[PDB]
Design a protein around this ligand. Sequence first.
Ligand SMILES: NC(=O)C1=CN([C@@H]2O[C@H](COP(=O)(O)OP(=O)(O)OC[C@H]3O[C@@H](n4cnc5c(N)ncnc54)[C@H](OP(=O)(O)O)[C@@H]3O)[C@@H](O)[C@H]2O)C=CC1
Ligand SMILES: NC(=O)C1=CN([C@@H]2O[C@H](COP(=O)(O)OP(=O)(O)OC[C@H]3O[C@@H](n4cnc5c(N)ncnc54)[C@H](OP(=O)(O)O)[C@@H]3O)[C@@H](O)[C@H]2O)C=CC1
Ligand SMILES: NC(=O)C1=CN([C@@H]2O[C@H](COP(=O)(O)OP(=O)(O)OC[C@H]3O[C@@H](n4cnc5c(N)ncnc54)[C@H](OP(=O)(O)O)[C@@H]3O)[C@@H](O)[C@H]2O)C=CC1
Ligand SMILES: NC(=O)C1=CN([C@@H]2O[C@H](COP(=O)(O)OP(=O)(O)OC[C@H]3O[C@@H](n4cnc5c(N)ncnc54)[C@H](OP(=O)(O)O)[C@@H]3O)[C@@H](O)[C@H]2O)C=CC1
Lengths: 262, 262, 242, 242
Amino acid sequence: MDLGLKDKVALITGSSAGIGFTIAEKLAEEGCHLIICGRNSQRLEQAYQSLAQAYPAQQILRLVADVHQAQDSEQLIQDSLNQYGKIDILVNNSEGANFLIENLSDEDWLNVFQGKLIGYIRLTNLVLPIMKKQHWGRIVNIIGTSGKEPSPRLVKSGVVNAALMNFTKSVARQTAPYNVLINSVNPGVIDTPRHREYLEIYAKKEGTTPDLIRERILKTIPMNRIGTTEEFANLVVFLASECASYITGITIPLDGGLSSSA
Amino acid sequence: MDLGLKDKVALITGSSAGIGFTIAEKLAEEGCHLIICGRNSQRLEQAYQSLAQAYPAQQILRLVADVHQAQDSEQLIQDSLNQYGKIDILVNNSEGANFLIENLSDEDWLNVFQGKLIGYIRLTNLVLPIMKKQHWGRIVNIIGTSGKEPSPRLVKSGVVNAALMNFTKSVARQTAPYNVLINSVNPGVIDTPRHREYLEIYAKKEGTTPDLIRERILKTIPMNRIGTTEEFANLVVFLASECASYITGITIPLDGGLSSSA
Amino acid sequence: MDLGLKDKVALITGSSAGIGFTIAEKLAEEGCHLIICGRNSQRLEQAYQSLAQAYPAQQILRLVADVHQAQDSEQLIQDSLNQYGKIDILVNNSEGNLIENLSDEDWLNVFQGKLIGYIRLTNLVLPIMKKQHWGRIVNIILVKSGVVNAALMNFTKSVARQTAPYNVLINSVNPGVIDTPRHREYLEIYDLIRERILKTIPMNRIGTTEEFANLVVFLASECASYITGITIPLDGGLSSSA
Amino acid sequence: MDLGLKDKVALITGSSAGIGFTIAEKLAEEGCHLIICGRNSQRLEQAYQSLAQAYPAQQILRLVADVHQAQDSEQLIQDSLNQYGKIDILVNNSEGNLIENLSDEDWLNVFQGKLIGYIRLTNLVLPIMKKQHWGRIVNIILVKSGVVNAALMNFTKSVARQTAPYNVLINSVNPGVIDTPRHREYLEIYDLIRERILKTIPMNRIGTTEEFANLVVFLASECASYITGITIPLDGGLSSSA
Ligand SMILES: NC(=O)C1=CN([C@@H]2O[C@H](COP(=O)(O)OP(=O)(O)OC[C@H]3O[C@@H](n4cnc5c(N)ncnc54)[C@H](OP(=O)(O)O)[C@@H]3O)[C@@H](O)[C@H]2O)C=CC1
Ligand SMILES: NC(=O)C1=CN([C@@H]2O[C@H](COP(=O)(O)OP(=O)(O)OC[C@H]3O[C@@H](n4cnc5c(N)ncnc54)[C@H](OP(=O)(O)O)[C@@H]3O)[C@@H](O)[C@H]2O)C=CC1
Ligand SMILES: NC(=O)C1=CN([C@@H]2O[C@H](COP(=O)(O)OP(=O)(O)OC[C@H]3O[C@@H](n4cnc5c(N)ncnc54)[C@H](OP(=O)(O)O)[C@@H]3O)[C@@H](O)[C@H]2O)C=CC1
Ligand SMILES: NC(=O)C1=CN([C@@H]2O[C@H](COP(=O)(O)OP(=O)(O)OC[C@H]3O[C@@H](n4cnc5c(N)ncnc54)[C@H](OP(=O)(O)O)[C@@H]3O)[C@@H](O)[C@H]2O)C=CC1
């Protein structure tokens, strides 16, 4: 399927590892030029070298930026514009809340809202005039199924994820006549560094092994397997495509059937 | 129907006018003692005199407090405890976001999150240990249908409302074994001072009359009428009751059929 | 709370036992006159005697009827109308690799049960309620079951939208685990099993028919005058626990 | 993007025109062999010739069948299996005061259409797909219509849960306003009417069959290997505009 992405410019946030890195690879494969970013310079340079060596025909700009920070996010967009003169695609991908409700303080909630929640809203606001001006844009938000059905070990995430799903609908409605399409994808369980970190921290809290936490997860997923970042990236790349030109304002679970199992 | 509310202590926030005032009246009618509050002292004293004269057999504590503010909210709960020694019911009711997305700044969003969103979360956190300790509690959050299906003239509200609906489910799950039940009610269009203020500000933005804005609203509601605060309060009072002892974690539209019309 | 139900006439289907029986009790307590019905004439007679003794001032009509049959349902409505001259409230309450071995005939049979049963009775009472400008309809809602229930939830919304201008309000309630005869029977054909179910309910307790009935009676009241087209889970928090 | 569809066998129902026809084209373009079907033999012959000429290297079986009839649907599946030895993909695509005047017979007739039609064809292909450990089923989903569509959305979830361990994935797509023959016909029996519909669509444009088909082909691909049980609106933003 020709996805019409040749020479499009994609900004993928949080793209030195996990879901974000594989999305960057797959967009480069379809002919996009990239902007990649992350907080840790060493990890970012490793990712940059991997992508540059794999897709030497594509332009790739790597920038150290914390996209929870206003200054870094504003400067990321300006650097991107200085390099490419346009941004066609934005993938919003950044870290959510950390791993009883009465015990969470105001500060705890405020740090949550000042992370991924305003992070995605801010970068959306920053790219909208760019994409509107050219009557072509795609924004894909990487959210999480907890926004739809919350999980006990994920309370703050669920609140943030619900908010972002609602935001997605409101902005989609406003930007639709400009051919600026905005969607979200809710990962189920996808095998990334963060997922494997979740396996360690909860095996300890629960006094068990990563393997047993994983067997318990696998029993909940109809497919009886944890998704790969490639499987996840395929949908994101489709939504970022010319082929997805009538799809906007929706949130799609990518979860091995987890939502059918609720 | 005996609702089992005699001598229960109810805190109704934002209760000097509109939905909140009528909820206070109806809870007093069923035999509760009250705490009422608001920001404007003059408006609050008028409400206090109205309720005290109508329900002289009930105790009523009135306090000036902005329940978007941490200090005022903490002190409201301590004052309530000093007066009554317990809080049985909390009705979360406070002002939402004010009347294009790219144009909203970080500060604008942050003020939103520091209003009703953290306001309801904070007061929930403050009352939970009180209600848990006595294995009896009810929290009813007054949200808004925009959390379910957002409206163009209500973007920031929708984001906040979605978040709060998700929060409601997560906290309900955790507090259920303590007989501390938490639900939300999503008003449609209910005839309050704020609603009538909405009619003025949008008749001006649109160059028309309040009457015509109202006729346009009425065509969207299946019942062909705007709800009264009494109709709205009936459900809240039911949810705050002993009769609602198996209902928790849900959000109920109270909207004249507006949700069936989406 | 004054529910405004004195002298209202309520038809509660499946009311000889369980959830339907306790809904009938609570409606009588609020001042309704009743029609109660069921297939098991003996269970229905027991129910009727219990209600008549507890509520000697209320009128109670009992009718043997299978509300999955057209002719029975038509005559149930005609018989109720003849007795009372009005029907104010209807509570619809009737009984509801693996998937690819369900035949055409299997699926047709489930559609001819509770699905068309609730639709048909709704249709039969709507003219009467529209004439009155007063009505309340409350619908008590594996693979087959889920399909029927999704269908009925959507039917509830569609009808509510159309009938709202006549003050004929229709809503649905979705029970979690409620201590009914089916439930106590459903345990034994499968505490032990109970202890596993309790672990899945956040409240850690099975609901009572009384707890369930309270909500149905609210929705059937004058106090619910601005509530229509909605489906409410009454489930001890199951729906907050995916 | 390589969809992994070379030599996969796809049955697309209602494929002589409109959405089904363009889905068949796009599948052939990705390397599938096809079964196309329809009731109107003349329209079906036109479709078949168009496809055979555009995709001379692909196999295309055309069968006249009414996929709301049991016997036609059984023979459609048997005939496809005989020709190809496998069925990898099924796309279910067939035709779908007011409420209280819908009779029992009216409702029974709608349930015997698209509702049981999609369920029956699903059931008929599931053994074949489970044998293969490879399948994709995509379901193209007033009062009657909404009831059927809610039922089918829920059916999609239930079947997806059961068949996921066999790599038989099932999803649904809900079109908004798509420029099909029914649509251009549906205008005239009621631009003018078009200009009012366009005002309701945030994108301010009616979708093309090509735009719709692209998503169906994605969902039917190897690339959608972790996606099952979901329903996706393809609607130019209608669903973000209540
Ligand atoms: N994996 C899963 O199963 C699930 C994932 N998700 C969501 O998916 C998204 C991706 O998660 P996942 O791939 O597992 O995470 P990983 O931690 O495996 O990868 C995250 C990547 O993003 C970078 N990153 C994180 N936060 C920021 C930031 N503020 N600024 C810049 N770079 C950042 C990280 O680099 P560095 O640390 O150097 O910045 C790293 O490159 C997240 O939004 C997460 O909440 C949700 C549900 C389930
Ligand atoms: N009316 C409707 O149709 C709708 C209402 N809602 C929601 O319902 C709730 C009630 O709205 P409504 O009755 O129309 O509002 P009104 O403005 O008519 O009444 C609000 C009352 O609450 C008080 N109040 C507001 N904010 C605060 C605060 N931070 N601290 C203390 N008191 C406060 C006001 O007094 P003072 O100003 O003196 O503090 C007043 O007594 C709100 O959460 C609103 O978002 C949502 C959708 C539709
Ligand atoms: N209990 C639960 O937790 C759940 C219940 N539900 C739904 O709740 C409703 C009531 O369930 P519950 O009380 O547990 O069931 P029970 O079997 O305990 O009680 C059913 C009552 O309805 C009557 N009844 C059943 N079918 C018919 C019929 N076709 N015509 C006339 N009367 C009938 C029975 O009498 P007779 O046998 O004499 O006709 C009996 O009086 C049903 O709609 C069910 O599908 C759904 C999910 C969970
Ligand atoms: N177009 C839209 O915007 C919307 C569409 N839908 C759904 O989308 C799907 C396709 O719609 P669309 O292309 O607009 O419809 P069209 O009528 O334009 O095309 C329908 C195609 O399906 C065939 N068909 C219909 N019924 C049967 C049957 N029982 N057996 C065999 N073939 C059949 C027709 O051929 P023949 O007549 O020869 O059998 C024709 O090839 C349907 O499932 C519809 O309900 C839902 C909502 C909106």
